[PDB]
Design an enzyme around this catalytic site. Structure first.
Site, PDB file in Angstrom:
ATOM      1  N   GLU A 185      -6.427  33.315 -15.924  1.00  0.00           N
ATOM      2  CA  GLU A 185      -6.935  31.967 -16.126  1.00  0.00           C
ATOM      3  C   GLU A 185      -7.806  31.598 -14.933  1.00  0.00           C
ATOM      4  O   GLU A 185      -7.504  31.979 -13.799  1.00  0.00           O
ATOM      5  CB  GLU A 185      -5.792  30.956 -16.288  1.00  0.00           C
ATOM      6  CG  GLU A 185      -6.246  29.511 -16.434  1.00  0.00           C
ATOM      7  CD  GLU A 185      -5.099  28.525 -16.337  1.00  0.00           C
ATOM      8  OE1 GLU A 185      -5.145  27.645 -15.453  1.00  0.00           O
ATOM      9  OE2 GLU A 185      -4.151  28.630 -17.143  1.00  0.00           O
ATOM     10  N   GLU A 195     -10.200  21.082 -11.113  1.00  0.00           N
ATOM     11  CA  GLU A 195      -8.932  20.426 -11.391  1.00  0.00           C
ATOM     12  C   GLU A 195      -8.777  19.256 -10.435  1.00  0.00           C
ATOM     13  O   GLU A 195      -9.089  19.371  -9.246  1.00  0.00           O
ATOM     14  CB  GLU A 195      -7.748  21.391 -11.252  1.00  0.00           C
ATOM     15  CG  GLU A 195      -7.405  22.135 -12.532  1.00  0.00           C
ATOM     16  CD  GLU A 195      -6.119  22.928 -12.419  1.00  0.00           C
ATOM     17  OE1 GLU A 195      -6.015  23.766 -11.500  1.00  0.00           O
ATOM     18  OE2 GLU A 195      -5.211  22.714 -13.250  1.00  0.00           O
TER      19      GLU A 195
END
Ligand code: CA
Ligand code: CA
Length: 480
Positions: free
Chosen positions: A360, A365
């Site tokens: 991933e 974020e």
């Protein structure tokens, strides 16, 4: 013989602004030659005595150019002491160099189309008279002047300035390029359509960086600008200078719901692996809407099944996937404690196995309770957040909720570089130990705004921040 420059810079009325030179002046043209622009553009009018002059406005210093004798125009003087340059004077001054082309615009006549057709004929004769057909390229708002230029010179460079005529019909009349205002090009595939049919693309009145980057991202042929020096800086910074070529992009001019050609919907409210508090809706304009050129992912304090919050999670899976390349996303983060916006990428085929074995990548974020940090992270079988071995970095971002920032990754065979405003803050390297350390062969991008969760919810949810909107200007993916 000639040593033409190869850039995309076209000096709008010359390089007048930075050095405060007069517009459409010899100093403006010479400044564009000194900078190294591909071409300098100028506007030609015809005096009442049929003397071609260079000026943009129909009235020069309060004198109507078409209705006054050329000798009357010489009463007026420009800021640098210059007199209004005739077309011969401008053509001759540019004839003395060989690096910068000459872009000639014939302004539509405010008298009659016949008089403006005569201006078109007079311009061609003087171009032939001074033997400067290799210097001059033609653009015009009047379509008949464009067709007249092609009649007198069959292989002259001609471009149209009104967006009404289609690209396919321009090629039918043997025009060589399209020169529309940059707002016209914000219609899926328009720039690359005209290029498919062999027409060069030019955009004018482009003075802002985001528009220049957007034009360079789609690899437009020329950019007419009033800030030529700024455009040169952005040309070196653009990924196309580093060899990157755009393969897929969504600039969100769609004005509606996210395009079914580009995005799928992740639907459900089962925690999504992090005990998240939101239900991701399916094709609901209340959580995902494209308006005013930006995608809007909106989290709403509203009930949805067994959840108190609804939001959106758009996925490019099964629609566009890629291995390696540069991913570029420009977004304005939503403000508020409890939010968890994310820009990230997951593998499409999961060849190595279920998460986190196949890996991933988290391009962006952000947690609402810590507004000074934006995180980039990679997740692998060996390095992931479940076992607390993931490798990632935080970087303080100033004004993340008030102005757009560009979050980007550069994904190579050997490493992955993380960028926030062209600053590299994290480099994840392939250790050549196998899939566990480096599991990367083809992923897909994901856009979502999560509420709460094992990371975002540790400080609770300020229930007043709703409705919270994440605005994404565009999503671009380059490849070498
Ligand atoms: Ca012009
Ligand atoms: Ca946009």
């Amino acid at each position: 013989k000639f040593n033409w420059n190869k850039n995309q810079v076209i000096a709008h009325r010359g390089a007048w602004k930075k050095n405060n030179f007069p517009q459409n002046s010899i100093a403006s043209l010479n400044e564009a030659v000194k900078l190294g622009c591909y071409g300098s553009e100028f506007d030609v009018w015809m005096t009442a005595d049929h003397i071609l002059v260079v000026n943009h406005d129909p009235e020069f210093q309060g004198l109507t150019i078409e209705k006054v004798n050329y000798a009357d125009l010489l009463t007026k003087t420009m800021s640098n002491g210059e007199k209004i340059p005739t077309l011969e004077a401008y053509l001759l001054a540019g004839k003395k160099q060989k690096s910068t082309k000459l872009i000639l615009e014939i302004k539509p006549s405010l008298i009659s189309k016949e008089r403006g057709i005569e201006v078109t004929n007079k311009c061609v004769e003087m171009v032939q008279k001074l033997k400067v057909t290799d210097w001059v390229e033609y653009i015009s708002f009047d379509y008949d002047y464009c067709k007249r230029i092609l009649t007198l010179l069959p292989n002259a460079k001609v471009a149209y300035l009104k967006g009404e005529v289609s690209a396919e019909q321009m090629k039918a009349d043997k025009l060589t390029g399209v020169d529309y205002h940059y707002s016209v090009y914000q219609k899926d595939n328009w720039i690359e359509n005209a290029q498919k049919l062999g027409l060069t693309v030019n955009a004018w009145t482009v003075n802002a960086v985001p528009e220049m980057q957007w034009l360079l991202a789609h690899n437009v042929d020329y950019i007419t600008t009033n800030e030529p020096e700024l455009l040169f800086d952005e040309i070196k910074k653009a990924p196309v200078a580093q060899g990157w070529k755009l393969k897929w992009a969504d600039e969100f001019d769609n004005s509606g719901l996210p395009l079914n050609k580009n995005w799928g919907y992740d639907v459900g409210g089962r925690g999504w692996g992090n005990n998240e508090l939101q239900y991701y809706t399916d094709a609901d304009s209340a959580n995902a809407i494209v308006k005013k050129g930006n995608l809007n992912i909106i989290a709403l304090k509203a009930e949805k099944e067994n959840r108190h919050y609804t939001s959106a999670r758009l996925v490019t899976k099964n629609k566009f996937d890629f291995k390696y390349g540069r991913v570029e996303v420009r977004a304005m983060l939503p403000k508020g404690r409890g939010l968890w916006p994310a820009i990230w990428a997951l593998p499409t085929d999961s060849k190595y196995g279920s998460w986190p074995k196949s890996g991933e990548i988290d391009i962006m974020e952000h947690v609402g309770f810590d507004p000074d940090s934006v995180h980039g992270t990679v997740h692998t079988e060996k390095f992931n957040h479940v076992i607390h071995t993931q490798v990632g970095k935080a970087l303080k971002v100033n004004n993340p909720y008030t102005e757009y920032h560009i979050y980007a990754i550069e994904w190579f065979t050997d490493h992955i570089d993380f960028f926030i405003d062209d600053q590299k803050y994290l480099t994840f390297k392939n250790t050549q130990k196998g899939s566990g350390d480096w599991p990367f062969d083809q992923n897909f991008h994901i856009l979502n705004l999560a509420v709460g969760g094992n990371w975002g919810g540790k400080k609770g949810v300020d229930d007043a921040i709703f409705p919270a909107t994440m605005k994404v200007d565009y999503v671009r993916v380059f490849q070498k």
